[PDB]
RNA sequence: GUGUAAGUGCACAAGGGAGCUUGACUGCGAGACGGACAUGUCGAGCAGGGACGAAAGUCGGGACUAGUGAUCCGGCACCUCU
RNA sequence: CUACAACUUGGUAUUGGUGCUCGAUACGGUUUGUGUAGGAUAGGUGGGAGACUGUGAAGCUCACACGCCAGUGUGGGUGGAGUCGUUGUUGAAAUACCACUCUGAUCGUAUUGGGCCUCUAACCUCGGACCGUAUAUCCGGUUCAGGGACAGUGCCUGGUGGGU
RNA sequence: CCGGUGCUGGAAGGUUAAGAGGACCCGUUAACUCCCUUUGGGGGUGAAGCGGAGAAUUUAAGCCCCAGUAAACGGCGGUGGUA
RNA sequence: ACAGGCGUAGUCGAUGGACAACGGGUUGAUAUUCCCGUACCCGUGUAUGUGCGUCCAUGAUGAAUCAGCGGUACUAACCAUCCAAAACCACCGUGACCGCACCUUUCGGGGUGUGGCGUUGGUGGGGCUGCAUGGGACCUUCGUUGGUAGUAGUCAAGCGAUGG
RNA sequence: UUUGAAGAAUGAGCCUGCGAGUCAGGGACAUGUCGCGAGGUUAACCCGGGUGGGGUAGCCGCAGCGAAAGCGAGUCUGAAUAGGGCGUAUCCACACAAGAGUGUGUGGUGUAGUGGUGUGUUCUGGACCCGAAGCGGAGUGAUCUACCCAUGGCCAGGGUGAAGCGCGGGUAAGACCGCGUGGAGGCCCGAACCCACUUAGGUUGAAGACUGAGGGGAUGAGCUGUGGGUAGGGGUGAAAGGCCAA
RNA sequence: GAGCCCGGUACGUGAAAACCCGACGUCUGUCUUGAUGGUGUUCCCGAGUAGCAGCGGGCCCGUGGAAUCUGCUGUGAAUCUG
RNA sequence: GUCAACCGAGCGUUGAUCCGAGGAUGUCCGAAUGGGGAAACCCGGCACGAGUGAUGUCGUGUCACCAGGCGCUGAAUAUAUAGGCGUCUGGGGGGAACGCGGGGAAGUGAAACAUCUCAGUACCCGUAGGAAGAGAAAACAAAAUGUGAUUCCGUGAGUAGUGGCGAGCGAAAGCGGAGGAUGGCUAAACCGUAUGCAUGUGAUACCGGGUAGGGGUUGUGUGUGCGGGGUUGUGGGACCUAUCUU
């Protein structure tokens, strides 16, 4: 399996590495991780594999953190970009969990786990204005104030 | 057999052997097996009745691939 | 006595002995026997190329009859067949 | 007699990581070429007129060892300019520098493999707990715990086989 | 009574499938060297490649082999002479 | 392979469980079934009245605090223990090692007891830094009570499980 | 049908009716007949109210020998015209050679097959007719009988008198002994009931496996009822190769 | 035993409604913003497939020298000098 | 109506009886479908309506199962899913043969028999249709300058061949014919697109050059769904780039 590491290991290298290993170890252990990707293709690879190495550095957190963004969980209001139907009062699609996270980036700095985000909670598809709430910690989560930009 | 999903790699039946013959079959199985998977878009783990040769086809071409194909067939995964 | 059972024959020797020696060949075969059929038996004579012999002539295994097994399927050498 | 079920053996796909050990393959410096003339195991071989030394050498005792035990090269260290140039003998010359590199024994590097000690992430759990579930010793899903690349299944293969 | 057959055990050996290997050869031919009448036909070497049947070697169980086992199937003899 | 094989919820299934009637008379033929008489078990209406509680509120409970007495006890840090960081002195068969007289083919190699730094090495006790332990408290504080706050709320006609 | 049957070898009660070499197919071979004649004939199909017209793709003949290349009234083998094999419709007339059996070269006479149909035999198909035991596939069947499950009921009557318990003797205490109670038992005699040992009868039966007189068990490994389950190479079997709708 | 009795035939007639054939006009699209040819090189021409090996089926073909077509496993390629 | 008469009572020129096409009603069982069930017989729910002094009763409808679409929720558990609730459309079974794909015997013949044959027949399964399936060359052929989708019929051919070279099986090419549609539609390179998982030259790039505001037609990636372009064999096509430019 020619696969692009993205992470280092024992034996194989380091990130960013080009290796031909044995298919069930990059079928089984890295790949259904996001710690490697397939190599197909030179530019497809090459940006899959710079972004996902970006995203792992970036992704990363601690209890300590976890109770930091507990208290920065408050910020301003994050707005969402919209393309909808203002006729009724519907929205035509539902918007992703990578859309708030990049409000987030591009207002507030965070950029969090799509996983977490309890979007159910949000309700979106009635147009209005959706609270949010996330999985921080164990114990702790913290809430978003929020709106959304009229159709 | 539950019959595999993704191919529809089915049975056959041989018959004959060397030694003078005697005719008799012996159906061909495939080699299904019972790997799991994960499917990230739905956050879901996912079971399926799949040969050796249906694992490559996955890992050269994906998984929602595959699940699209079979959504084709109908077949109630 | 005849290599080996028995018979028919063998002294005119097919018995015994000595010298050369490979016909223990190739290509054929008139006419005949015996014959359910397939098998089986002899066969003069012609040609090349030889043996022996001075020559005539004899030699296509053994004095004769037994000593072995069809067809199919494969194997080896050679062919100016495909 | 021939054959089949069932059982069983091994190879292979599922099916992987590190460690050790035992093989041969190739990139690599290496041990090592007893024919008399005679320092004489004369590495055969193509340029070929100095020979590497001094970015520290003879003869050397000793760390070493083979051994065709006459002999062979190797290193702590003195030594501080020593054997040597066709040394001359020859099918053939140095064993001077340089080198295509073979009959060799050793050993680094990609490997190709196996066996063994293990980790877990595939896989298995008629092990547990919770949910669907109000009822469910079913089934499924999450999780804990455990086993574990073994087992199970598929395909090829050998064997026993009046069980049929 | 453990020889015969069977069951259990243990491999020092010998035979031992499939698979991994692929030496050596045989087909084909890019390219040459002679033969000949001439309007190139017939001979030899014949690179790599593609193919053919392929050995050497490494191969487990089993079988042969070594012991045990009969409230396991099973088996248990004769002649002669002397008071 | 397909046909189909099993099977949980559940649903059917008495040969059993629970559940309210006995005697006499009658026709040409039925009879605990109709008739005569006396009884019983479900439900259903109308009305009668004895006690009824919701509204009134009649009695009877708790929340839980601001907090006070003493005490788990991040704990600032305290009462007792050893071992070994660097380690202190005494001594003992010392890898190379500096080296008394001699065995030893007549000698280049095979050694010994005392002798000296080193102390790859060995035993003993004491100023000893790191160590955690049980005991008593301080922060947090958890245990015992005065106001309170059984005040606003709360239980009290009934039927009451498809649950125990 | 038998060497041989009036045959005491088989078959037939009698009558009447029914009941066994057939058809397909350009099939094969042989032979009659008809058309054509070195030629013969079409198939599918198209057109046709009909049995008729067309349709040249094909087949059979017209030259064979040889494994084959290949050659050709010759060819194959073989070194060979040197013999032979096969073939050259057959006869006829003249020659030359031998009479080892006749051959060889000329001349003329000139070759007859094919398509319909009929008959006989024949090939493939059930192939003159009737007749098995038994093989395979798919289903029906446990209301009889074999066994098991779930739930109820039945076993008159009379005897024997285990364990235990009590009293008494005995004991140092026991063990032990006697009297009583208790009333167990794959216990006993005997009806119902379940079986079926002997024997007689029946034996074109009252009966497609019974009756009469006797007999075994008869509180148990019981008999039976209602409902249910196991199904064919399979079930079930206190096992006989027994039972699974006479 | 019927041409001339009857029923009916040869022949010609007949459908308010439903059904089927086409026929039309609706309705629906669809090309119209276009084409013929030129010219030198990169890119594409249907992937777990075709191919090869191992067991097998069926093809005139019974594993045979045995193509083509194929079923299960295992391995597994290129895009037109393919 | 009739076997099938008898009796009684009636209707009909105002057009009966009779015939044809469409409608209505259409008890109960049956795929059977509210639940259940020994088939045609037992019990119910819900909305409405009729009815009783109230209950009982009665009538009209509707309520199964799965597959898919849409809608609400998203349990363990975070994303979120399986699942649950409502609605909409389908399927469900029967049939005489004919078809396609799959499975798939045996008696028979071989004078035995296993390979073979009987036969890939009978039978079984899954699905159809009025017909089915196949079908446009990754084909045949032999140097002929050929053919040109497929299928079904005639011949080739009982041949070449295959085969315990035994019984027996057995083509195709080619040729003549029926019918003709020598038929059409797509994917990919390439663009324009909505997007969706990612990131950030955060800029000299997104476009027809150029005169240029921005400061991103997201800057660059990558698959997804839509729309163009493209459908070939003597190769074609998309980029490119001239020419006439209906």
């Not at chain 1, 990059?26 to 690879?45: D, H, K, M, Q, T």
């Not at chain 1, 990578?98 to 980036?105: C, F, G, L, R």
């Amino acid at each position: 399996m020619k696969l692009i590491l993205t992470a280092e290991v024992e034996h194989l290298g380091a990130a960013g590495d080009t290796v031909e290993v044995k298919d069930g170890y990059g079928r089984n252990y890295l790949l259904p991780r996001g710690l490697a990707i397939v190599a197909s293709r030179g530019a497809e690879r090459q940006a899959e594999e710079i972004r996902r190495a970006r995203e792992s550095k970036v992704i990363r957190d601690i209890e300590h953190a976890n109770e930091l963004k507990t208290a920065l969980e408050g910020l301003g209001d994050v707005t969402l970009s919209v393309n909808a139907a203002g006729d009724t009062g519907k929205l035509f699609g539902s918007v992703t969990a990578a859309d708030v996270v990049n409000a987030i980036k591009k207002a507030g700095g965070p950029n969090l786990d799509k996983r977490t985000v309890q979007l159910a909670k949000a309700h979106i598809k009635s147009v209005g204005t959706h609270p949010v709430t996330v999985k921080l910690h164990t114990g702790v989560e913290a809430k978003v104030s929020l709106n959304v930009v009229a159709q | 057999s539950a019959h595999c999903q993704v191919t529809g790699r089915g049975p056959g039946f041989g018959n004959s052997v060397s030694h003078s013959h005697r005719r008799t079959p012996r159906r061909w199985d495939p080699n299904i097996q019972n790997k799991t998977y994960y499917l990230p878009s739905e956050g879901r783990r996912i079971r399926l009745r799949v040969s050796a040769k249906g694992i490559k086809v996955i890992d050269r071409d994906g998984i929602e691939a595959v699940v699209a194909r079979m959504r084709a067939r109908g077949e109630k995964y």
